[PDB]
Amino acid sequence: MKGDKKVIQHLNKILGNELIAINQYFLHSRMWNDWGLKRLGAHEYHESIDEMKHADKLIERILFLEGLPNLQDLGKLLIGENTQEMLQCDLNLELKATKDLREAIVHCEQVHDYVSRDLLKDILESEEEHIDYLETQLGLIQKVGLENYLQSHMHE
Amino acid sequence: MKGDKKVIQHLNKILGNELIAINQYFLHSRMWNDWGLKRLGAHEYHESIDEMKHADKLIERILFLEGLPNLQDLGKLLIGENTQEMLQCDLNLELKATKDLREAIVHCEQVHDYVSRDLLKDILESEEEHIDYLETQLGLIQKVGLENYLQSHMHE
Amino acid sequence: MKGDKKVIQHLNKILGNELIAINQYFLHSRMWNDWGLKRLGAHEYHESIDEMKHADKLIERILFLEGLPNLQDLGKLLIGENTQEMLQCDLNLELKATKDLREAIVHCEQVHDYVSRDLLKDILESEEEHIDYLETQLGLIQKVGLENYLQSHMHE
Amino acid sequence: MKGDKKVIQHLNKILGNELIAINQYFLHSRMWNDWGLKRLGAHEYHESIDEMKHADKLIERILFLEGLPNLQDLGKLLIGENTQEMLQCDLNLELKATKDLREAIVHCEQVHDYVSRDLLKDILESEEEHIDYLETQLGLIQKVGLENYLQSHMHE
Amino acid sequence: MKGDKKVIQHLNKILGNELIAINQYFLHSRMWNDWGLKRLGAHEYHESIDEMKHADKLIERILFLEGLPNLQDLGKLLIGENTQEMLQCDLNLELKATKDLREAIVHCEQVHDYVSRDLLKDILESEEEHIDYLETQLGLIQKVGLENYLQSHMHE
Amino acid sequence: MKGDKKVIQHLNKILGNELIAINQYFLHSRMWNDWGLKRLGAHEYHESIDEMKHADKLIERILFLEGLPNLQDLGKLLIGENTQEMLQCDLNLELKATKDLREAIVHCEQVHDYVSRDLLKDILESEEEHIDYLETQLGLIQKVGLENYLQSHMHE
Amino acid sequence: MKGDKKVIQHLNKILGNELIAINQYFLHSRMWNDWGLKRLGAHEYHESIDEMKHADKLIERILFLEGLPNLQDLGKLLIGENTQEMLQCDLNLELKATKDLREAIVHCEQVHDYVSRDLLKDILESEEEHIDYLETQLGLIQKVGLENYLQSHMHE
Numbered sequence A, B, C, D, E, F, G: 001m002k003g004d005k006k007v008i009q010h011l012n013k014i015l016g017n018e019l020i021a022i023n024q025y026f027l028h029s030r031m032w033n034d035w036g037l038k039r040l041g042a043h044e045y046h047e048s049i050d051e052m053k054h055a056d057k058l059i060e061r062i063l064f065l066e067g068l069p070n071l072q073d074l075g076k077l078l079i080g081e082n083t084q085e086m087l088q089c090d091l092n093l094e095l096k097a098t099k100d101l102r103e104a105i106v107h108c109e110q111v112h113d114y115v116s117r118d119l120l121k122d123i124l125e126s127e128e129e130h131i132d133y134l135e136t137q138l139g140l141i142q143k144v145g146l147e148n149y150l151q152s153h154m155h156e
C-alpha cells in the first residue's frame, strides 16, 4: 500500500534510533556481565531485545508502505565506561528517541496514517517505560550509594 | 436496628481516620514504587488495602445502625518527602487512630453496643500491628543505616 | 521524566473525579446491600473498584511525570436517597467525568503527551461503559416498572 | 450440475427472504441488548445466526446448480420500535417466508429436484420453529403482562 | 468450676429465649415450605439450626459452671399467620433476645466471668445478623411489593 | 448517550461499507469453494466473518449513541468472474473502505468522540491487514504464475 | 585475561562480518515475508538469529580478553532485489566471512589462543552449513524452475 514519503522517512529515522539502541544496550549488557553485575546485564539484555522487536515492527511497516528500510546507516553509539555513565548514556539515547517518536506521530496524524501512529505510540509507551527504569536506577544510586547499588545488581 | 447516635458519630470518626490512611498509604506506596523501593511500596499498598477493608466494615455497621456514613469530610493527609519522614507520618497517623479507637470502644461499652466494640477492637488489633511494623522500620534504619535499609527494600 | 505542567493539572483533575466516584459508588453499593438489593450492591461495588484502578494508574502517571498527585481535595459526593436517585447521581457524575476527560485528552494531544492521552482514552472507554449501564438501568425502570426492577436486583 | 432455471429463481427468492431476516433479527437483537433486555437480545442473535446458516446453504446450492446467487437486492426490513412490535414484525416476515418456501417446494417437486426440495423442507422446519417461538412470546405477553414479560428477559 | 449464681440465671434466661426461637423458627420454616415459599422455608430452617447451636453452647457452659440447664420452661411462641407477620414476630423475638443478652453481658463483666461474656457476645453477633436479615426482608416487602417479594421466595 | 449527529452518519457509512464487504466476501468464498479452491474459500470466509464482527461493533456503538443503524441500504457488490478479478474487486472495496475510515476518524477527533475514533482505528488496522493480504496474493500470482497460485489454494 | 592484540583485531573483524549478516538476513527475511514467501522469510530469520548468537559469543570473548568490541562500524549490506539475487548476495557475504574466519584461526593457532580458535571453528561450521543451504537453493531454482521454487516457499 503506497505510504506517504515523509512518513516512511520518519519511520526510518525511528528505526535508526532503535538500531543504535540495540547495539548500545547489547554491548552495555555484556560489559555488565563481564564485570559480574549480572542483574544489570540481564535487564539490559532484555532492553536490547525489546528494541530488536520494535525494529522488526518498523521494518515490516515500512515494507508494507512500499518504502525501503534503512539498516545500513548506524548512528553514534553512546557507550559508558562505568555503570553511572552507561545508565546516563542509555537515558540520553532514550530522550532523543522519544523526541523523534513524537515528531513522527505528529506527521502521521497530519496525513491520516493512523495505523503508523498507533505503532509509534506503542513503541513510545515502551521507551517511556525504559526512561522510568533508567531515571529510577540513577536515583537509587543516590539513595543507597553506588557500592550498595552495584552490590544489589551482582546476582539475578 | 436503631443505634446510639454517639456510637454512630464515633464510628464515623474512626471511618474518617481510615479514609485519611487509605489515601496516605496509597500515595506513599506509589511514591516508593516510583523511586524503585518496591518492597516498601508493596507493603504500604497492603496497608492501604487493609484500611480499605476496615472502612468497608465501618460503613456497613453504620448503615445497619441506621446512620449516615460520612465519606465526604477528608482530614489532612500526612505526606512525607523521604522514607524516614513517610514512616514517621504513618506512625503519627496511627497513634491518632488508636487513641480515637480506645475512646470509641469506651463509649460502645457504656451503651452496651458490644458488637460495635468487637469490630473496633479488631480494627485496633490491626492498627497496633501497623504501629509495631512502623516502629520496627524506624529502629532498623538506626541499626543498619539508612542506605542499607533502603537497599534492602529495593526488590520484592 | 519532566511532564507538562498543565497535563499534570489535568491528570489531577481526572483523579479528583475518580476519588469522588470511588466513595460515591462504594457508599451506594453498601446502601443497596443494606437494603437487600444485593445485585445492585455487587455491581456498584465493581464500579467502585474500577474507579480505584483508574485512580491508581493516574497517580502512577502523575508521579512518573514528576508531579504531585492530589489525594487531599475531595469534591462533592452526589448521594441519592433511593435507587432512581442514586442511579441518576452516578450518571450526573459520569457525564462530568467524561467532559473533563475529553478536555484533558485535547491538551495531552497538543503537548504531544501521547502516552497520557492513551491512558485517558482507556479511562474514557470505561466511563462510557458505565454511562451505558446507567442509562440502561434507568430505562429498564421505565420498561418493567420500579417494583419489578428492584425485585430483579435482590439476588446476586 | 445445470439446474432448472425456475428452481434457481425460487432459491434466489428464498435467499432474498433470508437476507432480510438476517439483518432484521440482528438489528432487533442489538436493540434489545442496548435496552438491557439481554435474554431477548441473545435469543434474537441466535435467530439471526440460524438465518445466516440457511443463506449459506442456499448460496452453495445455487452455485452447485450453476446459478448466480443474488446477494445484491435487499428487500424491506420490518423494524419495530418496541418489543411488541419487533416480535410481530419478525412474525410477519416469517409468515411471508414460509409461504414462499411452500411455493418453491411445489416447483421443486414438479421438476423432480428432490434435493432442493429437501433443503427447503429443512429450512421450513426451522422457520416453523421460529413461528412457534414468536407466537409463544406474544401469547406470554398477554398471560403475564408486558412488564413481567420484559423483566423475565433482562438477564440471560 | 463453680460459677456465679446470677450468671447461671442469666445463662438460663438466654437459653430460654433460644429454645423459644428454635421452635418458632422451625414452625415458620415448615409453614413456608407447606405454602410453597421454599426459599423462606430453607432460610428460616437455617435460622432454627443456628439457635439450636447457641442453645447447645449455653447448655454446655451452664453444666461446666455446675448449674442446671432449664429445658423445661418454654416461653410464649410468637407465631405469625402470614409472611409479613411471621417476619415481624421473629424480629420482635430477636429484639427481646438482644435486650436480655446485653443485660447478661453486663453482669458477667461485673463478676469477671469473661469467658461467659465472650460466649454471649458471639451469640449477640449472630442475633444482630438475624435482625439485619429480618429488617431487610421487611424493607424489601415495601420496596418491591408483597406479591413480588413472595414470588422471589418460591424457589431456592 | 447523545452522540454527535455527524459521527453517527460516519458510523453508518462505515457500516454500509462493511455490509457490502460481508456479502461480497461471502459470495467470493462460496464461489472459490464451488471451484475447489478451498484454501481461498476458507480464507475469504474468515474475511467475511471479520467484517460481520466489525458491523456488529458499529451497530452497537450507533445504538449507544442513540442513532439508528442503517442495515437497509446495500451498496454495489464488486463480484469478480475469476480469481484475479475477485481479489482485485476485494482490494478496490478495501481501498474505498479505508478512505472512508480515515475521513470518519478525522471527524470523530474534531468533535472529541475519542472512543468512536478508537473503534474506527481498530477496524482500519484490520482493513489494512486485509489490504496487505490482497496485495500479497496479487503479487504472488505474478511471481509463481496463476496455475501454481491456484494449485497452492486447492487444499486447506 | 589480557589477550593477544591481533587476535582481538581478528575477533572484531569477524564480529563486523556478523553484524552485516544480521542486518542483511533480517531485511531479506522481512522482504520475503512481505512478498508472501513465508517459508523463505522464516528460514532467513533463523539465519539472522544464528548470526546474532555468533556476534554475542564474539563480543563475550573480546571482553574476556580485555579488548573493546566494535559494534559501531557497519560494513556494506548486500541487499538483493529478487529471490535469486538475495540468495546470491547472502552467498557472497558468506564466502567473505569464511575466508576471514580461516585467516583468524591461523593467527589464533600461532599465538596459542586455542579457545579463540575453537570458538571460530564452531562459527565456521555454522557458516559452512549456511553456504550449503544457499548453494542448494540456487541449485533447486535451476532444477525446478523459479516459479515452482517460489511456490514451494509460500507456506511454512
Ligand code: HEM
Pocket: B019, B022, B023, B026, B049, B052, B053, B055, B056, B059, C019, C022, C023, C026, C049, C052, C053, C055, C056, C071
Ligand atoms: C485513593 C482511594 C483508593 C485507591 C487509590 C484504591 C485502590 C485500590 C486498589 C488498586 C484495589 C485492588 C483492586 C484489584 O484487586 O485489582 C482496591 C481494593 C479495594 N478497595 Fe480501594 N482504593 C481506594 C479507596 C477505597 C475506599 C475509600 C474504600 C472503602 C470505602 C475501598 C475499598 C476497597 C475494598 C473493599 C477493596 C478490596 C480489597 C480486597 O479485599 O482484596 N477503597 N483499592
Ligand code: HEM
Pocket: E019, E022, E023, E026, E049, E052, E053, E055, E056, E059
Ligand atoms: C422443635 C424442636 C426441634 C426440632 C423440630 C429440631 C429439628 C432439627 C433437625 C431437622 C436437625 C437436622 C438434623 C439432620 O437432619 O441431620 C437438627 C439439628 C440439630 N439440633 Fe435440633 N431440633 C429441635 C430442637 C433442638 C434443641 C432443643 C436443641 C439443643 C438443645 C437442638 C440441637 C440441635 C443440634 C446441635 C443439631 C445439629 C446441627 C448441625 O450441626 O447441623 N435441637 N434439629
Ligand code: HEM
Pocket: D019, D022, D023, D026, D049, D052, D053, D055, D056, D059, F019, F022, F023, F026, F049, F052, F053, F055, F056, F071
Ligand atoms: C448484517 C449483516 C451480518 C452481520 C451483522 C453478521 C454477524 C455475524 C456474527 C457476529 C457472527 C459470529 C462470528 C463469530 O463470533 O464467530 C456471524 C457468523 C456467521 N455469519 Fe454472519 N452476519 C451478517 C451477515 C451474514 C450473511 C449475509 C451471511 C451469509 C450469506 C452470514 C453468514 C454467517 C455464518 C455462516 C456464520 C457462522 C455461524 C456458525 O456456524 O456459527 N452472515 N455473523
Ligand code: HEM
Pocket: A019, A022, A023, A026, A049, A052, A053, A055, A056, A071, G019, G022, G023, G026, G049, G052, G053, G055, G056, G059
Ligand atoms: C537489525 C538489527 C536486529 C534485529 C532487527 C534483531 C531482531 C531480533 C528478534 C526479532 C529477536 C527475537 C526476540 C524474541 O522474540 O524473543 C532477536 C533475538 C536475539 N538477538 Fe537480535 N536483532 C538485531 C540485532 C542484534 C545484535 C546486534 C545482536 C547481538 C550482537 C543480537 C542478539 C540477539 C540475541 C542473542 C537474541 C536471542 C536469540 C535467541 O537465543 O533466541 N541481535 N533479535
Ligand SMILES: O=C1NC(=O)c2c(NCc3cc(O)cc(Cl)c3)cccc21
Pocket: D068, D069, D070, D071, D072, D073, F027, F077, F078, F079, F080, F081, F082
Ligand atoms: O449478488 C450478486 N451475485 C452475483 O453473482 C453477482 C454478480 N455476478 C458476477 C459473476 C460471477 C461469475 O462467476 C460469473 C458471472 Cl457470469 C458473473 C454481480 C453483481 C452482484 C452479484
Ligand SMILES: O=C1NC(=O)c2c(NCc3cc(O)cc(Cl)c3)cccc21
Pocket: D027, D077, D078, D079, D080, D081, D082, F068, F069, F070, F071, F072, F073
Ligand atoms: O436499517 C434500518 N435501521 C433502522 O433502525 C430501521 C428502521 N427503524 C425503525 C425504528 C426503530 C426505533 O427504535 C425507533 C425508530 Cl424511530 C425507528 C426502519 C427501517 C429500516 C431500518
